[PDB]
Amino acid sequence: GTKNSSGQIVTEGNSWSDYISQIDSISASIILDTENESYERRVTAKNLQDPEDKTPELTIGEAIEKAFGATKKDGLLYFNDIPIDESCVELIFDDNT
Amino acid sequence: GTKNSSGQIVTEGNSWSDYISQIDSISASIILDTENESYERRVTAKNLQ
Amino acid sequence: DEDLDTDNDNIPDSYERNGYTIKDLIAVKWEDSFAEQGYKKYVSNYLESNTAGDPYTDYEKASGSFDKAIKTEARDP
């Protein structure tokens, strides 16, 4: 949904398909799973190879803190009174990453 | 195919039928045949009348 | 000395001579001490805009502001 000049929004001719692949070309995929729901986000990264690219980069802990709305409490990370660390969950990577 | 002002070309609503007969009204037809292919061209002539 | 015939938004001398380089969305002269920075060299055409029959022009193709899913070796014209 996007709004034109008259203040109303329109959903006609605006597909979601023609923004899929581009996002999956430039982003990292982060999947969280609690015991009730799941969450899946895409965060943009910095291609370090080509030097005209100006994208402000982060680390993976910063990206987890930024993507989900998660409070830094005493240095650690808390999300809906759940502790999230590198020491208190299970991390799953595929072999290339 | 013809190109508009934005540099891209369009093929929609441009038929080839509505230029057939006019060409066949004003041209001479030349057919060459070699032993591998054939070629057929139309060259305009001069109505002397 | 900006006598570009086609409006491909770039210097015809930097077209026909040595080359050029898109930096900060502008086209500057090709330097010989730029390969170490990560930049590359592009050589193109001036008498026509789309010098490979792509749907995009040279300025759309060098500065990669055309589609982000295109692989990076399809950047040079």
Coordinates of N, CA and C in Angstrom, one line a residue:
Chain A
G1 N 0.8 -1.2 0.0 CA 0.0 0.0 0.0 C 0.9 1.3 0.0
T2 N 0.6 2.2 -0.9 CA 1.2 3.5 -1.0 C 0.2 4.5 -1.2
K3 N 0.4 5.7 -0.7 CA -0.6 6.8 -0.8 C -0.2 7.8 -1.9
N4 N -1.1 8.2 -2.6 CA -0.9 9.3 -3.6 C -1.2 10.6 -3.0
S5 N -1.3 11.7 -3.9 CA -1.4 13.0 -3.4 C -2.7 13.4 -2.7
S6 N -3.8 12.6 -3.0 CA -5.1 12.9 -2.4 C -5.3 12.4 -1.0
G7 N -4.3 11.6 -0.5 CA -4.4 11.2 0.9 C -4.9 9.8 1.1
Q8 N -5.4 9.2 0.0 CA -5.9 7.8 0.1 C -4.8 6.9 -0.4
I9 N -4.8 5.6 -0.1 CA -3.8 4.7 -0.5 C -4.4 3.8 -1.6
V10 N -3.5 3.2 -2.4 CA -3.9 2.4 -3.5 C -3.1 1.1 -3.5
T11 N -3.8 0.0 -3.8 CA -3.2 -1.3 -4.0 C -3.8 -1.8 -5.3
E12 N -3.1 -1.4 -6.4 CA -3.4 -1.9 -7.7 C -2.2 -1.7 -8.6
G13 N -1.7 -2.8 -9.2 CA -0.5 -2.8 -10.0 C 0.7 -2.7 -9.2
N14 N 0.7 -2.7 -7.9 CA 1.9 -2.7 -7.1 C 2.1 -4.1 -6.6
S15 N 3.0 -4.9 -7.3 CA 3.2 -6.2 -6.9 C 4.3 -6.3 -5.8
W16 N 4.4 -7.4 -5.1 CA 5.5 -7.6 -4.2 C 6.6 -8.5 -4.8
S17 N 6.4 -9.1 -6.0 CA 7.3 -10.0 -6.6 C 8.6 -9.2 -7.1
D18 N 8.4 -8.1 -7.7 CA 9.5 -7.3 -8.2 C 10.3 -6.6 -7.2
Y19 N 10.2 -6.9 -5.9 CA 11.1 -6.4 -4.9 C 11.7 -7.6 -4.1
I20 N 11.4 -8.9 -4.5 CA 11.8 -10.0 -3.7 C 13.3 -10.1 -3.9
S21 N 13.7 -10.4 -5.2 CA 15.1 -10.9 -5.5 C 16.1 -9.9 -5.1
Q22 N 15.9 -8.6 -5.4 CA 16.8 -7.5 -5.1 C 17.2 -7.5 -3.6
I23 N 16.1 -7.7 -2.7 CA 16.4 -7.8 -1.3 C 17.2 -9.0 -1.0
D24 N 16.9 -10.1 -1.6 CA 17.7 -11.3 -1.3 C 19.1 -11.3 -1.9
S25 N 19.4 -10.2 -2.7 CA 20.7 -10.1 -3.2 C 21.6 -9.3 -2.2
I26 N 21.1 -8.4 -1.4 CA 21.9 -7.5 -0.6 C 21.8 -7.7 0.9
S27 N 21.1 -8.7 1.3 CA 20.8 -8.8 2.8 C 21.2 -10.1 3.4
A28 N 21.4 -10.1 4.7 CA 21.6 -11.3 5.5 C 20.3 -11.7 6.2
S29 N 20.1 -13.0 6.3 CA 18.8 -13.5 6.8 C 19.0 -14.0 8.2
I30 N 18.2 -13.5 9.1 CA 18.2 -13.9 10.6 C 16.9 -14.4 11.0
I31 N 16.9 -15.6 11.5 CA 15.7 -16.3 11.9 C 15.8 -16.6 13.4
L32 N 14.9 -16.0 14.2 CA 14.7 -16.3 15.6 C 13.6 -17.3 15.8
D33 N 13.7 -18.2 16.8 CA 12.6 -19.0 17.2 C 12.5 -19.1 18.7
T34 N 11.5 -18.6 19.3 CA 11.1 -18.8 20.6 C 10.2 -20.1 20.7
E35 N 9.6 -20.3 21.8 CA 8.7 -21.5 21.9 C 7.3 -21.3 21.6
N36 N 6.9 -20.0 21.2 CA 5.6 -19.7 20.8 C 5.5 -19.3 19.3
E37 N 6.4 -18.5 18.9 CA 6.4 -17.9 17.5 C 7.7 -18.1 16.9
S38 N 7.8 -17.5 15.7 CA 9.1 -17.4 15.0 C 9.2 -16.0 14.4
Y39 N 10.4 -15.6 14.0 CA 10.5 -14.3 13.4 C 11.6 -14.4 12.4
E40 N 11.5 -13.7 11.3 CA 12.5 -13.7 10.2 C 12.7 -12.4 9.6
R41 N 13.9 -11.9 9.7 CA 14.2 -10.5 9.2 C 15.4 -10.5 8.3
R42 N 15.5 -9.5 7.5 CA 16.6 -9.3 6.5 C 17.3 -7.9 6.8
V43 N 18.6 -8.0 7.1 CA 19.3 -6.8 7.4 C 20.4 -6.6 6.3
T44 N 20.6 -5.4 5.8 CA 21.5 -5.1 4.8 C 22.9 -5.1 5.3
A45 N 23.9 -5.5 4.5 CA 25.3 -5.6 4.9 C 26.1 -4.7 4.0
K46 N 27.4 -4.8 4.2 CA 28.4 -3.9 3.5 C 29.3 -4.7 2.7
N47 N 29.2 -4.6 1.3 CA 30.1 -5.2 0.5 C 31.5 -4.5 0.6
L48 N 32.5 -5.2 1.1 CA 33.7 -4.5 1.4 C 34.6 -4.4 0.1
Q49 N 34.2 -5.1 -1.0 CA 35.0 -5.1 -2.2 C 35.0 -3.9 -3.0
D50 N 33.8 -3.4 -3.3 CA 33.8 -2.3 -4.3 C 33.8 -1.0 -3.5
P51 N 34.7 0.0 -3.8 CA 34.9 1.1 -2.8 C 34.0 2.3 -3.0
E52 N 33.1 2.3 -4.0 CA 32.1 3.4 -4.1 C 30.9 3.1 -3.2
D53 N 30.8 1.9 -2.7 CA 29.6 1.6 -1.9 C 29.8 2.1 -0.5
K54 N 28.8 3.0 -0.1 CA 28.8 3.6 1.2 C 27.6 3.1 2.0
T55 N 27.9 2.0 2.6 CA 26.8 1.5 3.5 C 27.4 1.3 4.9
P56 N 26.8 2.0 5.9 CA 27.4 1.9 7.2 C 27.1 0.5 7.9
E57 N 28.2 -0.1 8.3 CA 28.2 -1.5 8.6 C 28.0 -1.7 10.1
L58 N 27.7 -2.9 10.5 CA 27.5 -3.3 11.9 C 28.2 -4.6 12.1
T59 N 28.1 -5.1 13.4 CA 28.4 -6.5 13.7 C 27.2 -7.2 14.0
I60 N 27.3 -8.6 14.1 CA 26.2 -9.5 14.2 C 25.4 -9.3 15.5
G61 N 26.2 -8.9 16.6 CA 25.5 -8.6 17.8 C 24.7 -7.3 17.7
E62 N 25.3 -6.3 17.1 CA 24.6 -5.0 16.8 C 23.4 -5.2 15.9
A63 N 23.5 -6.1 15.0 CA 22.4 -6.4 14.1 C 21.3 -7.1 14.7
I64 N 21.6 -8.0 15.7 CA 20.5 -8.6 16.4 C 19.9 -7.6 17.4
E65 N 20.7 -6.7 17.9 CA 20.1 -5.7 18.8 C 19.3 -4.7 18.0
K66 N 19.6 -4.4 16.8 CA 18.9 -3.4 16.0 C 17.7 -4.0 15.3
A67 N 17.7 -5.2 14.8 CA 16.6 -5.8 14.1 C 15.4 -6.0 14.9
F68 N 15.5 -6.9 15.9 CA 14.4 -7.0 16.9 C 14.5 -5.8 17.8
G69 N 13.3 -5.5 18.4 CA 13.3 -4.4 19.3 C 13.7 -5.0 20.7
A70 N 15.0 -4.9 21.0 CA 15.5 -5.6 22.1 C 16.4 -4.7 22.9
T71 N 16.1 -4.7 24.3 CA 16.7 -3.7 25.2 C 18.1 -4.2 25.6
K72 N 19.1 -3.3 25.5 CA 20.3 -3.5 26.1 C 20.2 -3.2 27.6
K73 N 20.2 -4.3 28.4 CA 20.2 -4.1 29.9 C 21.5 -4.6 30.4
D74 N 22.2 -3.8 31.2 CA 23.5 -4.0 31.8 C 24.6 -4.6 30.8
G75 N 24.5 -4.2 29.6 CA 25.4 -4.8 28.6 C 24.8 -6.0 27.8
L76 N 24.0 -6.8 28.5 CA 23.4 -7.9 27.9 C 22.1 -7.5 27.1
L77 N 21.5 -8.5 26.4 CA 20.4 -8.2 25.6 C 19.1 -9.0 26.1
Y78 N 18.0 -8.2 26.3 CA 16.8 -8.8 26.8 C 15.7 -8.5 25.8
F79 N 14.9 -9.5 25.5 CA 13.8 -9.4 24.6 C 12.5 -10.0 25.2
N80 N 11.6 -9.2 25.5 CA 10.3 -9.6 26.2 C 10.6 -10.4 27.4
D81 N 11.4 -9.9 28.3 CA 12.0 -10.5 29.5 C 12.7 -11.8 29.3
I82 N 13.2 -12.0 28.1 CA 13.9 -13.2 27.7 C 15.4 -12.8 27.6
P83 N 16.3 -13.5 28.3 CA 17.7 -13.2 28.0 C 18.2 -13.8 26.7
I84 N 18.9 -13.0 25.9 CA 19.5 -13.5 24.7 C 21.0 -13.1 24.7
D85 N 21.9 -14.0 24.6 CA 23.3 -13.8 24.6 C 23.9 -14.7 23.5
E86 N 25.2 -14.7 23.5 CA 25.9 -15.7 22.7 C 26.1 -17.0 23.5
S87 N 25.8 -16.9 24.8 CA 26.0 -18.0 25.7 C 24.8 -18.7 26.2
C88 N 23.6 -18.2 25.9 CA 22.3 -18.7 26.5 C 21.3 -19.2 25.5
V89 N 21.7 -19.3 24.2 CA 20.8 -19.9 23.2 C 21.6 -20.9 22.3
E90 N 21.0 -21.4 21.3 CA 21.7 -22.3 20.4 C 21.8 -21.6 19.0
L91 N 23.0 -21.5 18.5 CA 23.2 -20.9 17.2 C 23.4 -21.9 16.1
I92 N 22.7 -21.7 15.0 CA 22.8 -22.7 13.9 C 23.2 -21.9 12.6
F93 N 24.3 -22.3 12.0 CA 24.8 -21.8 10.8 C 24.9 -22.9 9.8
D94 N 24.7 -22.6 8.5 CA 25.1 -23.6 7.5 C 26.6 -23.4 7.2
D95 N 27.1 -24.4 6.5 CA 28.6 -24.7 6.5 C 29.4 -23.6 5.9
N96 N 28.8 -22.9 4.9 CA 29.6 -21.8 4.2 C 29.8 -20.6 5.1
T97 N 28.7 -20.2 5.7 CA 28.7 -19.1 6.7 C 29.5 -19.5 7.9
Chain B
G1 N 9.8 -3.0 -34.7 CA 10.3 -2.3 -33.5 C 10.7 -0.9 -33.8
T2 N 10.2 0.0 -33.0 CA 10.5 1.5 -33.1 C 10.8 2.0 -31.7
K3 N 11.7 3.0 -31.6 CA 12.0 3.5 -30.3 C 11.4 4.8 -30.0
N4 N 10.9 5.0 -28.8 CA 10.3 6.3 -28.4 C 11.4 7.2 -27.8
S5 N 10.9 8.2 -27.1 CA 11.9 9.2 -26.6 C 12.7 8.8 -25.5
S6 N 12.3 7.7 -24.7 CA 13.1 7.3 -23.6 C 14.2 6.3 -23.9
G7 N 14.3 6.0 -25.2 CA 15.5 5.1 -25.6 C 15.2 3.7 -25.7
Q8 N 14.0 3.2 -25.2 CA 13.6 1.8 -25.3 C 12.7 1.7 -26.5
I9 N 12.6 0.5 -27.0 CA 11.8 0.2 -28.2 C 10.5 -0.5 -27.8
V10 N 9.5 -0.4 -28.6 CA 8.2 -0.9 -28.3 C 7.7 -1.7 -29.5
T11 N 7.1 -2.9 -29.2 CA 6.4 -3.7 -30.2 C 5.0 -4.0 -29.7
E12 N 4.1 -3.0 -29.9 CA 2.7 -3.2 -29.5 C 1.8 -2.3 -30.2
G13 N 0.9 -2.8 -31.0 CA 0.1 -2.0 -31.9 C 0.7 -1.7 -33.2
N14 N 1.9 -2.1 -33.4 CA 2.6 -1.8 -34.7 C 2.5 -3.0 -35.5
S15 N 1.6 -3.1 -36.4 CA 1.4 -4.3 -37.3 C 2.3 -4.1 -38.5
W16 N 2.6 -5.3 -39.1 CA 3.3 -5.2 -40.4 C 2.3 -5.3 -41.6
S17 N 1.0 -5.6 -41.3 CA 0.1 -5.8 -42.4 C -0.2 -4.5 -43.2
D18 N -0.4 -3.4 -42.4 CA -0.7 -2.1 -43.0 C 0.5 -1.4 -43.7
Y19 N 1.6 -2.1 -43.9 CA 2.6 -1.6 -44.9 C 2.8 -2.6 -46.0
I20 N 2.1 -3.7 -46.1 CA 2.3 -4.7 -47.1 C 2.0 -4.1 -48.5
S21 N 0.7 -3.8 -48.7 CA 0.1 -3.6 -50.0 C 0.7 -2.4 -50.7
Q22 N 1.0 -1.3 -49.9 CA 1.6 -0.1 -50.4 C 2.9 -0.3 -51.0
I23 N 3.8 -1.2 -50.4 CA 5.1 -1.5 -50.9 C 4.9 -2.3 -52.2
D24 N 3.9 -3.2 -52.2 CA 3.7 -4.0 -53.4 C 3.0 -3.2 -54.5
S25 N 2.6 -2.0 -54.2 CA 2.1 -1.1 -55.3 C 3.2 -0.3 -56.0
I26 N 4.3 -0.1 -55.3 CA 5.3 0.9 -55.9 C 6.6 0.2 -56.2
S27 N 6.8 -1.1 -56.1 CA 8.1 -1.7 -56.2 C 8.2 -2.8 -57.2
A28 N 9.4 -3.1 -57.6 CA 9.7 -4.2 -58.4 C 10.3 -5.3 -57.5
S29 N 10.0 -6.6 -57.9 CA 10.4 -7.7 -57.1 C 11.5 -8.5 -57.7
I30 N 12.6 -8.7 -57.0 CA 13.8 -9.3 -57.5 C 14.1 -10.5 -56.6
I31 N 14.1 -11.7 -57.2 CA 14.4 -12.9 -56.4 C 15.7 -13.6 -57.0
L32 N 16.7 -13.7 -56.1 CA 17.9 -14.4 -56.4 C 17.9 -15.8 -55.8
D33 N 18.5 -16.8 -56.4 CA 18.6 -18.1 -55.9 C 20.0 -18.7 -56.2
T34 N 20.8 -18.8 -55.1 CA 22.0 -19.6 -55.2 C 21.7 -21.0 -54.8
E35 N 22.7 -21.8 -54.6 CA 22.5 -23.3 -54.4 C 22.3 -23.5 -52.9
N36 N 22.4 -22.5 -52.0 CA 22.3 -22.8 -50.6 C 21.1 -22.0 -50.0
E37 N 20.9 -20.8 -50.4 CA 19.8 -19.9 -49.9 C 19.0 -19.3 -51.0
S38 N 18.1 -18.4 -50.7 CA 17.4 -17.6 -51.6 C 17.3 -16.2 -51.0
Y39 N 17.1 -15.2 -51.8 CA 16.9 -13.8 -51.4 C 15.8 -13.2 -52.2
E40 N 15.1 -12.3 -51.5 CA 14.0 -11.6 -52.2 C 13.9 -10.2 -51.7
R41 N 14.1 -9.2 -52.7 CA 14.1 -7.8 -52.3 C 13.1 -7.1 -53.2
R42 N 12.7 -5.9 -52.7 CA 11.8 -5.0 -53.4 C 12.5 -3.6 -53.6
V43 N 12.6 -3.2 -54.8 CA 13.2 -1.9 -55.1 C 12.2 -1.0 -55.8
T44 N 12.2 0.3 -55.3 CA 11.2 1.2 -55.9 C 11.6 1.7 -57.3
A45 N 10.6 1.9 -58.1 CA 10.8 2.4 -59.4 C 10.2 3.7 -59.7
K46 N 10.3 4.2 -60.9 CA 9.9 5.6 -61.3 C 8.7 5.5 -62.2
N47 N 7.6 5.9 -61.8 CA 6.5 6.0 -62.7 C 6.7 7.2 -63.6
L48 N 6.9 6.9 -64.9 CA 7.3 7.9 -65.9 C 6.0 8.7 -66.3
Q49 N 4.8 8.3 -65.9 CA 3.6 9.0 -66.5 C 3.3 10.3 -65.8
Chain C
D1 N 34.5 21.8 -24.0 CA 34.9 20.6 -24.6 C 34.1 19.4 -24.1
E2 N 32.8 19.6 -24.0 CA 31.8 18.6 -23.6 C 30.9 18.2 -24.7
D3 N 31.4 18.1 -25.9 CA 30.6 17.9 -27.1 C 30.1 16.5 -27.3
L4 N 29.3 16.0 -26.3 CA 28.7 14.7 -26.4 C 27.5 14.8 -27.4
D5 N 27.5 13.9 -28.4 CA 26.4 13.9 -29.4 C 25.1 13.3 -28.8
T6 N 25.2 12.0 -28.5 CA 24.1 11.4 -27.8 C 24.1 11.9 -26.4
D7 N 22.9 12.0 -25.8 CA 22.8 12.4 -24.4 C 22.9 11.2 -23.5
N8 N 24.1 10.6 -23.5 CA 24.4 9.6 -22.6 C 25.1 10.1 -21.3
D9 N 25.1 11.4 -21.2 CA 25.4 12.2 -20.0 C 26.9 12.0 -19.6
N10 N 27.8 12.0 -20.6 CA 29.2 11.7 -20.3 C 30.0 12.3 -21.4
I11 N 31.3 12.6 -21.1 CA 32.3 13.2 -21.9 C 32.6 12.3 -23.1
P12 N 32.5 12.9 -24.3 CA 32.9 12.1 -25.5 C 34.3 11.9 -25.6
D13 N 35.2 12.8 -25.0 CA 36.6 12.5 -25.1 C 37.0 11.4 -24.0
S14 N 36.3 11.4 -22.9 CA 36.5 10.3 -22.0 C 35.9 9.0 -22.5
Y15 N 34.9 9.1 -23.4 CA 34.5 8.0 -24.2 C 35.6 7.5 -25.1
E16 N 36.0 8.3 -26.0 CA 36.8 7.8 -27.1 C 38.3 7.6 -26.8
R17 N 38.8 8.4 -25.8 CA 40.2 8.2 -25.4 C 40.2 7.2 -24.3
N18 N 41.3 7.1 -23.5 CA 41.7 6.2 -22.5 C 40.5 5.5 -21.7
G19 N 39.6 6.3 -21.2 CA 38.5 5.8 -20.4 C 38.1 6.8 -19.4
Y20 N 37.4 6.4 -18.4 CA 36.8 7.2 -17.4 C 36.4 6.3 -16.2
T21 N 35.8 6.9 -15.2 CA 35.5 6.2 -14.0 C 34.3 6.9 -13.3
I22 N 33.2 6.2 -13.0 CA 32.2 6.8 -12.2 C 32.6 6.7 -10.8
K23 N 32.5 7.9 -10.1 CA 32.8 8.0 -8.7 C 31.8 9.1 -8.2
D24 N 31.1 8.8 -7.1 CA 30.2 9.7 -6.4 C 29.1 10.3 -7.4
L25 N 28.7 9.4 -8.3 CA 27.7 9.6 -9.3 C 28.1 10.8 -10.3
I26 N 29.4 10.8 -10.6 CA 29.9 11.7 -11.7 C 31.0 10.9 -12.4
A27 N 31.4 11.4 -13.6 CA 32.3 10.7 -14.4 C 33.6 11.5 -14.5
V28 N 34.7 10.9 -13.9 CA 36.0 11.6 -13.9 C 37.0 10.9 -14.8
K29 N 38.1 11.5 -15.0 CA 39.1 10.9 -15.9 C 39.8 9.7 -15.3
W30 N 40.2 8.8 -16.2 CA 40.8 7.6 -15.7 C 42.3 7.8 -15.2
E31 N 42.5 7.5 -14.0 CA 43.9 7.6 -13.4 C 44.5 6.3 -13.4
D32 N 45.9 6.3 -13.5 CA 46.6 5.1 -13.5 C 47.0 4.6 -12.1
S33 N 46.7 5.4 -11.1 CA 46.9 4.9 -9.7 C 45.5 4.7 -9.0
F34 N 44.6 4.2 -9.7 CA 43.2 3.9 -9.1 C 42.9 2.5 -8.9
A35 N 43.7 1.5 -9.5 CA 43.4 0.1 -9.4 C 43.5 -0.4 -8.0
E36 N 44.5 0.2 -7.3 CA 44.7 -0.2 -5.9 C 43.6 0.3 -5.0
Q37 N 42.9 1.3 -5.3 CA 41.7 1.8 -4.5 C 40.5 0.9 -4.7
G38 N 40.5 0.1 -5.7 CA 39.3 -0.7 -6.0 C 38.6 -0.3 -7.3
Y39 N 38.9 0.9 -7.8 CA 38.2 1.3 -9.0 C 38.7 0.6 -10.3
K40 N 37.9 0.7 -11.3 CA 38.2 0.0 -12.6 C 38.2 1.0 -13.7
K41 N 38.3 0.5 -15.0 CA 38.3 1.3 -16.1 C 37.2 0.9 -17.1
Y42 N 36.5 1.8 -17.7 CA 35.4 1.6 -18.6 C 35.7 2.3 -19.9
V43 N 35.5 1.6 -21.0 CA 35.7 2.2 -22.4 C 34.4 1.9 -23.1
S44 N 33.8 3.0 -23.7 CA 32.5 2.9 -24.3 C 32.4 3.6 -25.6
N45 N 31.2 3.9 -26.1 CA 30.9 4.5 -27.4 C 30.3 5.8 -27.2
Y46 N 30.4 6.7 -28.2 CA 29.8 8.0 -28.1 C 28.7 8.2 -29.2
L47 N 28.8 7.6 -30.3 CA 27.8 7.9 -31.4 C 26.5 7.3 -31.1
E48 N 26.4 6.3 -30.2 CA 25.1 5.8 -29.8 C 25.1 5.7 -28.3
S49 N 23.9 5.6 -27.8 CA 23.7 5.6 -26.3 C 24.0 4.2 -25.8
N50 N 23.1 3.3 -26.1 CA 23.1 1.9 -25.5 C 24.1 1.1 -26.4
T51 N 25.3 1.0 -25.9 CA 26.4 0.5 -26.7 C 26.5 -1.1 -26.7
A52 N 25.5 -1.7 -26.1 CA 25.5 -3.2 -26.2 C 24.1 -3.7 -26.5
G53 N 23.1 -2.9 -26.7 CA 21.7 -3.4 -26.9 C 21.0 -3.7 -25.6
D54 N 21.6 -3.5 -24.5 CA 20.9 -3.6 -23.2 C 19.7 -2.6 -23.1
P55 N 18.7 -2.9 -22.3 CA 17.7 -1.9 -22.1 C 18.2 -0.6 -21.3
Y56 N 19.3 -0.7 -20.7 CA 19.9 0.5 -20.0 C 21.0 1.1 -20.7
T57 N 21.2 2.4 -20.5 CA 22.3 3.1 -21.1 C 23.6 3.0 -20.4
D58 N 24.6 3.7 -20.9 CA 25.9 3.6 -20.3 C 26.0 4.2 -18.9
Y59 N 25.3 5.4 -18.7 CA 25.3 6.0 -17.4 C 24.5 5.2 -16.4
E60 N 23.5 4.5 -16.9 CA 22.7 3.7 -16.0 C 23.5 2.4 -15.6
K61 N 24.4 2.0 -16.5 CA 25.1 0.8 -16.3 C 26.4 0.9 -15.5
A62 N 27.1 2.0 -15.7 CA 28.3 2.2 -14.9 C 28.1 2.4 -13.5
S63 N 27.4 3.5 -13.2 CA 26.8 3.8 -11.8 C 25.7 2.8 -11.6
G64 N 25.9 1.8 -10.8 CA 24.9 0.7 -10.6 C 23.7 1.1 -9.8
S65 N 22.9 2.0 -10.5 CA 21.6 2.4 -9.9 C 20.5 2.0 -10.8
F66 N 20.6 0.8 -11.2 CA 19.7 0.3 -12.3 C 18.9 -1.0 -11.8
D67 N 19.5 -1.9 -11.1 CA 18.9 -3.1 -10.5 C 20.0 -3.7 -9.6
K68 N 19.6 -4.0 -8.4 CA 20.7 -4.5 -7.5 C 20.9 -6.0 -7.5
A69 N 20.1 -6.7 -8.3 CA 20.3 -8.2 -8.4 C 21.1 -8.6 -9.5
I70 N 21.5 -7.6 -10.4 CA 22.5 -7.9 -11.5 C 23.8 -8.2 -10.9
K71 N 24.5 -9.2 -11.4 CA 25.8 -9.5 -11.0 C 26.8 -8.4 -11.4
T72 N 27.9 -8.4 -10.7 CA 28.8 -7.2 -10.8 C 29.6 -7.1 -12.1
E73 N 29.7 -8.2 -12.8 CA 30.5 -8.2 -14.0 C 29.7 -7.7 -15.2
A74 N 28.4 -7.5 -15.0 CA 27.5 -6.8 -16.0 C 27.4 -5.4 -15.8
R75 N 28.4 -4.8 -15.2 CA 28.4 -3.3 -14.9 C 29.1 -2.5 -16.0
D76 N 30.2 -3.0 -16.6 CA 31.0 -2.3 -17.6 C 30.2 -2.4 -18.9
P77 N 30.3 -1.3 -19.7 CA 29.3 -1.2 -20.8 C 29.6 -2.1 -22.1

